[PDB]
């Protein structure tokens, strides 16, 4: 059984946005609620609302969300969240989850099954696409049997970007770092990998869904 939220985007302040949860491997029925929980960047978990998946049941909102947010069943496999009057407090990753149950009658008021998140970024800016620069040691450093190469993804908005290495055939000893948001509002992040010095070049695959940007940078071990 699986969840998947879509619809997160960069919205302007005071705008409105619609998120959607989509279920896979199961369909909605009696016995449990479907719910939305958000999480601001570097903050805790904040509950938004729930809806009993067969509809007949109730629809309860966090006091702070009543009035702005609205939750709906759009089908036997999709649940929606209407968001109006978005401030920047509403900037968060928006999760979707299934109330678990230990029996057929009703839930146990805990969320067992969770989607991965869709990310709402509320900002007065336009989407900027990142610039990508290879990260490679000083030419003047005497080489070694391994080397750490990497990619700098600089100045994008909104999140996320994806960094994959040699198209996903490479993952051992790959470190991709959390993104930082500079004073400009533009995010940056680096990602490195550690390989043996085959002399064979490595290539990083950066993607910024919000600008339909895909750029592929080959990182020579920078020996001038």
């Amino acid at each position: 059984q699986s969840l998947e939220e879509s619809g997160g985007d960069l919205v302007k302040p005071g705008a409105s946005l619609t998120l959607t949860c989509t279920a896979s491997g199961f369909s909605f029925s009696a016995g449990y609620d479907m719910c939305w929980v958000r999480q601001a960047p570097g903050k805790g978990l904040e509950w938004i609302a729930c809806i009993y998946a067969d509809g007949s049941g109730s629809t309860y909102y966090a006091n702070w969300a009543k009035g702005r947010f609205t939750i709906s069943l759009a089908s036997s496999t999709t649940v929606t969240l209407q968001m109006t009057g978005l401030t920047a407090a509403d900037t968060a990753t928006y999760f979707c989850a299934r109330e678990g149950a230990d029996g057929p009658d009703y839930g146990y008021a805990a969320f067992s099954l969770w989607g991965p998140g869709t990310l709402v970024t509320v900002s007065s800016s336009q989407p900027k696409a990142p610039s990508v620069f290879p990260l490679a040691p000083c030419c003047g450093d005497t080489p070694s049997s391994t080397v750490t190469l990497g990619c700098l993804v600089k100045g994008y908005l909104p999140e996320p970007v994806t960094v994959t290495w040699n198209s996903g055939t490479l993952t051992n000893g790959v470190r991709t770092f959390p993104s930082v948001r500079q004073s400009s509002g533009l995010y940056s992040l680096s990602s490195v990998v550690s390989v043996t010095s085959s002399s064979q070049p490595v290539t990083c695959n950066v993607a910024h869904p919000a600008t339909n940007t895909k750029v592929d940078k080959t990182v020579a071990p920078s020996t001038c």
Partner: protein, 217 residues
């Protein structure tokens, strides 16, 4: 809306040691109390529900007790893989009305300490097409270190103060060690007006330093 006061904000404990997190509800809730685990960049994972019953696939060293307004999570036999943020959660009101909701604690960040290591440090001089844009970003990496570091930049010995950002990977699930990326951003006029660049990773009394001269790379 109930307030879930979770203590403490952060705890640090050795491998194999035990830890006890606490939630107190500002108002009375139901025995339907749960506990989650959340590693960075991932959704939560249900650990416990109905106060003490384990979720599917949670080893017994995760333990939840409590009643009324106070509830406990107790992790023993701690491993590096347990390093995460941990959230409690309750349900209040009537399941037979649209009155009543769910409340989450504010999270506890658990730091499993392993044997203290010192970071190997790498410094990446800005690519040649960086300088052409009018802003350069020097990137610096601390690997496989415990415990937490603080980063200092020195442009020809002058400790920078601005244009610095930092990012730490999660504790490694095997040796408990962090990783860290620190970027110093300067104008191209600045960068071509100085020679040496220095990245000073400090771990208490210790310091590992990596440097490069601009004309060398």
């Amino acid at each position: 809306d109930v307030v879930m006061t979770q203590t403490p904000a952060s705890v640090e404990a050795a491998v194999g040691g035990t830890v006890t997190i606490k939630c107190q509800a500002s108002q009375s809730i139901s025995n339907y109390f749960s506990w989650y685990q959340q590693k960075p960049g991932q959704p939560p994972k249900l650990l416990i529900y109905k106060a003490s019953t384990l979720a599917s696939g949670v080893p017994s060293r995760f333990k939840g007790s409590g009643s009324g307004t106070e509830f406990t999570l107790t992790i023993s036999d701690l491993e590096c893989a347990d390093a995460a943020t941990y959230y409690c959660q309750s349900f209040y009101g009537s399941v037979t009305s649209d009155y009543g909701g769910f409340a989450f604690g504010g999270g506890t960040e658990v730091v499993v300490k392993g044997d203290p290591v010192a970071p190997t440090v790498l410094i990446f001089p800005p690519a040649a097409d960086q300088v052409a844009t009018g802003t350069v970003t020097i990137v610096c990496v601390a690997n496989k270190y415990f415990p937490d570091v603080t980063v200092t930049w020195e442009v020809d010995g002058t400790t920078q103060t601005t244009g610095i950002e930092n990012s730490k990977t999660p504790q490694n699930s095997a040796d408990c060690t962090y990783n860290l990326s620190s970027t110093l951003t300067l104008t191209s006029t600045q960068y071509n007006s100085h020679k040496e660049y220095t990245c000073k990773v400090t771990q208490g009394t210790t310091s590992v330093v990596q440097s490069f001269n601009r004309g060398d790379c």
